[PDB]
Amino acid sequence: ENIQEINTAISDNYTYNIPGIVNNNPFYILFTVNTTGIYKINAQNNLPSLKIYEAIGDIKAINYITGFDSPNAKSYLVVLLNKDKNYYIRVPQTSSNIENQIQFKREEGDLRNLMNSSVNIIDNLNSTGAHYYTRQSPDVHDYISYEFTIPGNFNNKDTSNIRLYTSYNQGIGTLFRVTETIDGYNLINIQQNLHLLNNTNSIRLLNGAIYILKVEVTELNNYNIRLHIDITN
Amino acid sequence: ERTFLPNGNYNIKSIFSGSLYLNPVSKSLTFSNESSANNQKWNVEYMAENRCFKISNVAEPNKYLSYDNFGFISLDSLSNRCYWFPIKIAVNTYIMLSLNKVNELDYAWDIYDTNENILSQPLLLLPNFDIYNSNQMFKLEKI
């Protein structure tokens, strides 16, 4: 577990190359930001998923903020970072020796709606029917997000019935519609206060459109959170 | 390496039809049957200095998508009217805003439809208010 360090405080944009000779072990990145703000942090293709920790300065305290460790699970982190404190990034095992890159970007736009949470990239929604996704559950009042695309071709008209719900943990969901420009994501907050635990209400969403569900855990009844996205037409 | 609209040759379609392709016809731009010809191919290039995009016809490489003084999309020599700010709202679907703002209004490519039929209709530059107007949505498909 070789701890590496970005000695220079990063600002706005930064790219850190994984050596490749540390891929056969879980390994850490120590860094700080030039200015307090909300950052998007991710591996090259959002793979692997990353964990982030807060470090108080011989250290005083280390606190898990957000992120999980599921193999082959795509995700990116959106986190408020303070310039006064230190931060660790746990990169898991790249059991494939391709060189990875950790990208840090300062967010000035709508993506700020996603702090603090990991955003799971869902890419297996090719059809109607049942789908579910299991991740380690955030504690109460903490967030986990999901970015997905409704199956079908987009025509601003074709639409699917989306049933979003959880298995055991209660959570409050906020649903955003995603658009993108040269300056990153734009988010339209289309729904709030969605109680996920055994939710029986469906939502009609546009085929081929991109959406993000931000979930606030309000009741931890299981170590894992399992989000169901059942699609009908 | 840029995932947002990488440089290169594209087809340009309206979401009303996946078989009608944008091409120049007598000074005006319109969506016509597949030609397998160079005039339906469009070279999209990002300009870092302006943070926008310019789009040329590959049959007429010096001709870019612009607009005249009456709200019609045209083909013309390179100028500030040729600068486009795309908004991706779906997989390959874009709303193309002009870099230039008149009033405090944004203007976008707009195609008329007759019950989702766009044949013979000319490409216009019209006011844009939201991301829900079907006539302002266009597919740019790499080739």
Numbering used by the authors:
A (entry chain A): 380 to 436, 451 to 626
B (entry chain B): 4 to 146
Quote the study that presented this structure, word for word.
We also obtained a high-resolution structure of the blade by combining the structures of HA70D3–HA17 and HA17–HA33, which were determined at 2.4 Å and 2.1 Å, respectively. Based on the crystal structure of the HA70D3–HA17 complex, the interactions between HA70 and HA17 bury a solvent-accessible area of ∼795 Å2 (per molecule). The structure of HA70D3 is almost identical to its equivalent domain in the full-length HA70 with a root-mean-square deviation (rmsd) of ∼0.93 Å over 232 Cα atoms. The major HA70–HA17 interactions are composed of 13 pairs of hydrogen bonds and salt bridges. In addition, HA70-Phe547 is buried in a hydrophobic region in HA17 composed of Ile18, Ile92, Ala93, Thr96, and Met140. HA17 has a compact β-trefoil fold and connects HA70 and HA33.
